[PDB]
From a paper:
In fungi, plants, protozoans, and some metazoans, sRNA production often depends on template-dependent RNA synthesis catalyzed by cell-encoded RNA-dependent RNA polymerases (RdRPs). In the filamentous fungus Neurospora crassa, silencing, or “quelling,” of transgenic arrays relies on RdRP QDE-1, PIWI/PAZ protein QDE-2, DNA helicase QDE-3, and several other components, including the ssDNA-binding protein RPA. Interestingly, QDE-1 may trigger quelling by producing long aberrant ssRNA copies (aRNAs) of ssDNA intermediates that frequently arise in tandem-duplicated genomic sequences. QDE-1 can subsequently use its aRNA product as a template to produce dsRNA intermediates.
To this end, we determined QDE-1Tte three-dimensional structure using x-ray crystallography. In each dimer, the two monomers are related by a non-crystallographic dyad. For example, the QDE-1Tte dimer had a pyramidal shape with a pair of double-ψ β-barrel domains (DPBB1 and DPBB2; residues 312–413 and 535–639) located at the base of each subunit. The “head” (residues 457–507 and 822–1006 of the catalytic fragment) and the “neck” domains (residues 428–532 and 784–821) of the two subunits adopted a slightly tilted back-to-back position, and the “slab” domain (residues 1–244) of each subunit protruded from the catalytic domain toward the corresponding head domain. The five domains formed an extensive groove, probably accommodating the template and the nascent RNA product, with the catalytic site located at the bottom. Superposition of 922 Cα atoms between the two monomers (dimer A/B) using the SSM server returned a root mean square deviation of 2.15 Å. The largest conformational differences between the two monomers occurred closer to the C-terminal end of the polypeptide chain. The homodimer interface is stabilized by a total of 119 and 115 residues of monomer A and B, respectively. Most residues at the interface originate from the upper “neck” and “head” domains, where the subunits display the largest structural differences. However, it showed a striking bias toward generating short RNA products rather than full-length copies.
Author numbering: 22 to 212, 226 to 249, 263 to 565, 568 to 676, 678 to 812, 817 to 868, 876 to 894, 907 to 922, ...
The structure:
């Protein structure tokens, strides 16, 4: 509708040749991927169809195929998972709760009658299912990441002609792909530098397989889908954009838990009201004890959660355990603030609890920098608070280094430390073992435990090396983000108190178990003040002090925080406009912080009405534009999609006014002047921009700053937006101080104290050397063999020349990193040898990686490139040096060699109880 665009927007999506029409979608999609990966044109027939395809494992279909030689080629692409692809033909797209996705990804192109957008079809991926995909079949949905067409900028034709035919292209008709008609329904914010994207959800309305009609695969429009989900005749009263936003409830990624009976769902008509006006339980309502037992059962938690975040048809938010239920019937209640459209809750998938997230066990959280200036403002003593905060930074940091340098002195304990600092557990479960990247584990802290399990020390330069990398990389996190750890703080779910036990400024926090703070332990909080705060805190009052009081009534509500239902304003609200619908709280009970805090009073949101303008046009006025009947209802849906998209794709000002605030407050060295309450208010209203259909745009933004602020022009980036310190004097600003003056120096200092220390080795005995005589014991033995040789001799010499060329390969390969590491591993694993040439290789062993040659390969590798390329041999052979180092450091009769298989090994962990008691005996 320009036209520039058209013709552009061609041919963005590839077509569908008659040889692929046979079905199914699975191979059709993955074959489309192969063809454009291999840059083969799909409009070359001379091709056919194979029934074996309907059965196999892509590599099977991918080895067809290829043959053909022009499919040689190449190989790849990334390829879908084992459980996924088989389900993509014969498992109907689903494993228990995890659906199979179709996901494409769009980035810009330049010219024309050229595309404009470049497709990237990711392979079939398992994700969790939502309600629509569960209802209509996961095969009928597509999600693409699309660049926003109002993100300036881009290549020039983009927005040279600002407009927006782009959006009209996405919404108006379908998009023909792999035989199907995909029609857009929802558009959301994305869940040197590249550009920002919009996630767009298409629903396949028809295609090559399809058949009518009300009252597989049937024909079925986006208009009927939403009519199912939303139930449209009973919801005309809604503003269409607000009804559009509600789509997000049917798309939310959730685990299905229980379907209730209509009686067992207790739809409350009123919210609990202020003693009085203000709802005191926004989004939160009780579930039964049994549903909570059930939710554990269903998902498999190691314990019943006291609270849950789900979805329940039209309902959304938090359910907590009713403590006053003792009994054995399942029930759940719902409240108005929960229920987001009028749902009759008829069919089963509107009656079923879909679980988003559970109450799980707290971890120490610390203090994000966003809260820093707020705290400084509400500090009693600002200097002492500065000194309070910085001190805690350096001590946790001292604490984690001294703990780690002491551990390193003793294998058992150095192993024990690594295990207490990360987790490959959820990765191990995944791949059935310790996933391995060439010759060594993927995760570094897994790499250490294996090389220590195999009997290595701080005699080995590589082991020293990795110990340093681990802690350094966790330092990096801290020097950028200022995630300043606070031993006495957690992130908790807010819950409200339905039983009237806590008073206006009283909260209840109990743990599900022993909370560790370094010195001391906790299992609840009583008779002590606590700071509560929802991220982000923008007002001085968005951080609130309250008294942590325990009530044994609520003993059973664990790992959450209970706010009162009493007084005028619910606490959740006081914390940056919160409510209880998933929102979590920064709960700090550190005395040194809390007691220097003094409460501020809730501001009044200033009159910003001339800039904030809700488009309240309803879904019923949109139908009335079509004249009556179901038809007028059918097109209204497409009116609304089309119009909601033009809104959805406007620039997210939320993030731009928040940036401006972070700059205007930093310069103005205030969070508590008048221009800060004006922005704080504004960024408040804009978090709801989506679901309120608010009109706030380039015009209003300029208009505002003209009339009420500075200061249109680029306000400066703050100093802490760099690495090293910019200006004149040791820093004044709290955040600059904390970054440049404290964190940087504290870290660099302690990084060095154990790079001192490496590095001291020379031959004092002590210290670290890549060289280890044990690790070349296969090499030397075979080198005098081979003296004395004949053609053995031929064996060794070509191995050594081979290895050379492989390390040469590493040199370049200095284009994805593990890929490179693998590419050149297989070239490493390719080095292959009357008489012992029958033995060493041992091809009754299925895979070259548990043979004796492999040792010799690696022990020889080591001597030649330990100089030199220590790394190169560890990333290829590391597990083969492990055999060696395990065999040789063993004497025999003082322990034999116990070989644990990958699964059994990934099933074992270091035994803290044993390490504590076994040192207790070594230090007699």
């Amino acid at each position: 509708q320009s036209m520039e665009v058209y013709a552009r927007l061609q041919n963005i999506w590839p077509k569908f040749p008659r040889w692929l029409h046979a079905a199914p979608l699975a191979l059709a999609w993955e074959l489309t991927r192969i063809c454009l990966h291999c840059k083969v044109d799909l409009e070359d027939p001379t091709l056919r169809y194979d029934p074996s395809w309907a059965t196999s494992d892509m590599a099977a279909l991918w080895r067809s195929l290829t043959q053909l030689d022009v499919f040689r080629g190449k190989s790849f692409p990334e390829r879908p998972s084992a459980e996924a692809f088989a389900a993509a033909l014969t498992g109907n797209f689903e494993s228990r709760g995890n659906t199979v996705v179709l996901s494409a990804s769009l980035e810009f192109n330049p010219s024309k009658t050229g595309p404009l957008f470049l497709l990237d079809m990711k392979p079939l991926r398992f994700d969790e299912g939502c309600r629509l995909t569960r209802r209509f079949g996961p095969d009928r949905f597509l999600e693409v990441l699309v660049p926003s067409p109002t993100a300036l900028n881009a290549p020039s034709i983009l927005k040279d002609g600002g407009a927006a035919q782009v959006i009209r292209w996405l919404t108006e008709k379908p998009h023909s792909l792999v035989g199907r008609q995909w029609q857009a329904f929802y558009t959301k914010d994305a869940g040197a530098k590249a550009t920002f994207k919009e996630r767009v959800h298409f629903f396949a309305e028809r295609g090559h397989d399809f058949r009518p009609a009300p009252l597989r695969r049937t024909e079925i429009r986006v208009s009927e889908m939403l009519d199912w989900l939303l139930q449209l005749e009973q919801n005309e009263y809604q503003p269409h954009l607000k009804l559009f936003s509600r789509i997000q409830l049917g798309l939310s990624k959730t685990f299905p838990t229980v379907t209730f009976e209509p009686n067992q769902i207790r739809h409350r008509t009123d919210d609990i009201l202020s003693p009085a006006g203000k709802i005191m339980n926004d989004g939160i309502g009780r579930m039964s004890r049994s549903v909570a037992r059930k939710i554990r059962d269903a998902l498999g938690l190691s314990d019943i959660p006291s609270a849950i975040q789900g979805r329940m048809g039209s309902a959304k938010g938090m359910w907590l355990m009713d403590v006053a239920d003792a009994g054995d019937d399942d029930w759940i209640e719902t409240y108005p603030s929960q229920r987001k459209w009028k749902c009759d809750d008829a069919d089963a998938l509107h009656r079923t609890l879909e679980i988003r997230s559970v109450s799980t066990e707290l971890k120490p959280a610390a203090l994000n920098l966003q809260f820093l200036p707020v705290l400084e403002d509400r500090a009693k003593d600002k200097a002492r608070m500065r000194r309070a905060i910085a001190a805690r930074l350096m001590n946790d940091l001292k604490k984690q280094f001294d703990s780690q340098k002491a551990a390193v002195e003793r294998p058992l304990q150095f192993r024990q430390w690594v295990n207490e600092c990360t987790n490959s557990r959820s990765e191990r479960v995944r791949h059935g073992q310790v996933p391995f990247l060439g010759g060594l584990p993927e995760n570094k802290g897994e790499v250490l435990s294996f090389l220590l399990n195999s009997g290595f020390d701080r005699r080995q330069k590589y082991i020293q090396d990795l110990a340093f990398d681990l802690q350094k990389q966790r330092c990096e996190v801290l020097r950028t983000k200022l995630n300043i750890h606070v031993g006495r703080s957690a992130y908790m779910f807010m819950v409200v108190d339905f039983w009237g036990v806590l008073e206006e400024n009283e909260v209840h926090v109990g743990f599900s178990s022993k909370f560790r703070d370094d010195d001391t332990t906790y299992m609840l909080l009583t008779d002590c003040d606590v700071l509560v705060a929802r991220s982000p805190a923008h007002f001085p009052s968005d951080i609130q002090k309250v008294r942590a009081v325990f009530k044994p009534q609520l003993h059973a509500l664990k790992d959450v925080i209970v706010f009162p239902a009493k007084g005028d304003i619910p606490l959740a609200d006081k914390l940056s406009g919160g409510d209880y619908d998933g929102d979590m709280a920064w709960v700090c009970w550190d005395p040194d912080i809390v007691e220097n805090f003094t409460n501020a009073d809730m501001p009044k949101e200033p009159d910003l009405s001339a800039y904030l303008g809700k488009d309240k046009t309803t879904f019923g006025e949109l139908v009335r534009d079509t004249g009556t009947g179901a038809a007028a209802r059918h097109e209204a849906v497409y009116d609304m999609i089309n119009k909601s998209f033009q809104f959805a794709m406007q620039p997210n000002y939320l993030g731009i006014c928040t940036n401006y605030k972070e700059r205007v407050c930093y310069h103005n060295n205030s969070v508590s002047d008048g221009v800060a309450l004006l922005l704080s208010t504004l960024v408040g209203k804009l978090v709801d921009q989506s679901k309120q259909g608010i009109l706030f745009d380039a015009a209003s933004w300029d208009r505002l700053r003209r009339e009420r602020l500075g200061g249109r022009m680029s306000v400066e980036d703050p100093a802490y937006k760099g690495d090293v310190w910019a200006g004149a004097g040791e820093p004044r600003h709290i955040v600059d101080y904390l970054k440049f003056a404290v964190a940087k120096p504290t870290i660099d200092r302690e990084l060095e104290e154990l790079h001192k220390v490496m590095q001291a080795s020379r031959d004092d005995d002590a210290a670290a050397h890549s060289w280890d005589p044990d690790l070349a014991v296969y090499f030397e033995n075979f080198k005098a063999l081979t003296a004395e040789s004949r053609s053995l001799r031929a064996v060794l010499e070509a191995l050594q020349n081979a290895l050379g060329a492989v390390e040469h390969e590493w040199k370049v390969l200095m284009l994805t990193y593990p890929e490179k590491v693998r590419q050149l591993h297989a070239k490493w694993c390719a080095i292959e040898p009357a008489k012992t040439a029958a033995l060493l290789e041992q091809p009754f062993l299925a895979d070259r990686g548990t043979s004796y040659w492999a040792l010799l390969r690696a022990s020889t590798a080591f001597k030649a490139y330990y100089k030199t390329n220590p790394k190169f041999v560890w990333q290829m052979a590391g597990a083969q040096l492990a055999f060696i180092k395990a065999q040789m450091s063993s004497g025999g009769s003082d322990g034999m060699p116990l070989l644990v298989t990958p699964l059994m090994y990934a099933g074992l962990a270091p035994d803290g109880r044993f390490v504590k008691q076994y040192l207790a005996r070594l230090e007699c």
